[PDB]
Symmetry: C3
Subunit: 99 residues, 3 copies
């Protein structure tokens, strides 16, 4: 409900969205296509969960606590691992596809 109107989410969304379109056009087999799409959708999923966690922390207050920062650091780490999994997925699958 109107969270999709922030810049960072739009660039993240459009990046993921763009990959799904690309994956939908590539001449690959079904299992590869599913994996190409799954890897980038997971990034969007995890980022949504990371932002959701961040919302809960900011909800509590602006006064800083060590665990408040750590929850955000762990959420970011989850996204990073997701992004790496996506790059690796496309790397392994689309290697030697152009030729």
């Amino acid at each position: 409900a109107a969270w999709i109107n922030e810049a960072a989410f739009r660039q993240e969304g459009v990046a993921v969205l763009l990959c799904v379109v690309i994956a939908a056009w590539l001449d690959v087999d079904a299992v590869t296509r599913v994996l190409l799409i799954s890897s980038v959708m997971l990034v969007m999923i995890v980022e949504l969960l990371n932002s959701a966690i961040e919302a809960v922390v900011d909800r509590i207050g602006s006064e800083y606590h060590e665990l408040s920062g750590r929850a955000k650091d762990l959420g970011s780490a989850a996204v990073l691992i997701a992004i790496i999994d996506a790059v690796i997925t496309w790397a392994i699958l689309l290697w030697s596809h152009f030729g």
Copy 2:
């Protein structure tokens, strides 16, 4: 309801075993369903925190539940795309 969610899993698992597909297709079909559960469980956990922070509404209280529900939505969508693509290929 996780009660119906659990039976929904079994049905997908039963169908997955029913169809004459190889191990890779079988792992993809079921994992996608399992990812929904994981995200839902994670979303439900986030919700449990929000609800005890306060019984009041806040800009950030409801913003979390939306982003969490969005994550579940994206997971369910990915699951449908997977079952569509694979079954289409299987019955090609």
Copy 3:
């Protein structure tokens, strides 16, 4: 932008570092994950199987980190509200254990079909 990434990549490193430093269980988990990838990378399998073997154990790490974040929130709130902090932790722990089960099963089935 380019500077958003440096800032976000920095929080990620603090996340992984703090998670590593604070628990032996996490360190041993990261080792188990790291090995599994190395093994997956060297196996003589097709590209989709390779990705499946890698992708799954990665998901374990992802869910682990997300859950650890959620745990940090309920500990932040304090002792008083504990009981629904308990349910949030129970839910998140289910997500972690499910993901690990999926990883274990996936590796079993796939390595079975290949070596068998």
